[PDB]
């Protein structure tokens, strides 16, 4: 029902905030976006750029995906992102996360027609 493109937007897009709102950000967002529903998803990145900017990465720099597929693309510009990483003390269902804001190139996997982001591979 939920397209892979929609799921990418749900898991990785947050254009409302231009940086990691607060120390609470990840705790709130991993829950709100249903990334703590079944397990504590252990790491996850949010992007604070427009959807059009992130989508445009699919026509940017073609690089190898971590799994060895060829459909990953690195942004020529740095982007505002927040990484969310599970604390050691985190215990499902109360998933707890460190919020780290950064500005880095993002790497996304794209697929489909139209050719859109479906996975967040890495940032560099």
From Swiss-Prot:
Its EC number is 4.6.1.18. Its main location: secreted. Pancreas. It is found in: Secreted. Substrate binds at residues 7, 10, 41-45, 66, 85. Keywords: Disulfide bond, Endonuclease, Glycation, Glycoprotein, Hydrolase, Lyase, Nuclease, Secreted, Signal. One of its GO terms (cellular component) is extracellular region. Disulfide bonds join 26-84, 40-95, 58-110, 65-72. Belongs to the pancreatic ribonuclease family. Interacts with and forms tight 1:1 complexes with RNH1. Dimerization of two such complexes may occur. Interaction with RNH1 inhibits this protein. Monomer. Endonuclease that catalyzes the cleavage of RNA on the 3' side of pyrimidine nucleotides. Acts on single-stranded and double-stranded RNA. This is Ribonuclease pancreatic. It comes from Bos taurus. The lineage of its organism: Eukaryota, Metazoa, Chordata, Craniata, Vertebrata. The chain holds residues 27 to 150 of 150 of the full protein.
């Amino acid at each position: 029902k939920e397209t892979a493109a929609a799921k990418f937007e749900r898991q990785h897009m947050d254009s409302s905030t231009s940086a990691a709102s607060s120390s609470n950000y990840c705790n709130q967002m991993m829950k709100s976006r249903n990334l703590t529903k079944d397990r504590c998803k252990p790491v996850n990145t949010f992007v604070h750029e427009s959807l059009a900017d992130v989508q445009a990465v699919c026509s940017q720099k073609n690089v190898a995906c971590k799994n060895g597929q060829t459909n990953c693309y690195q942004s020529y510009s740095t982007m505002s992102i927040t990484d969310c990483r599970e604390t050691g003390s985190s215990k499902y269902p109360n998933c707890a996360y460190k919020t780290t804001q950064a500005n880095k190139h993002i790497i996304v996997a794209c697929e489909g027609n139209p050719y859109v982001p479906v996975h967040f591979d890495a940032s560099v």
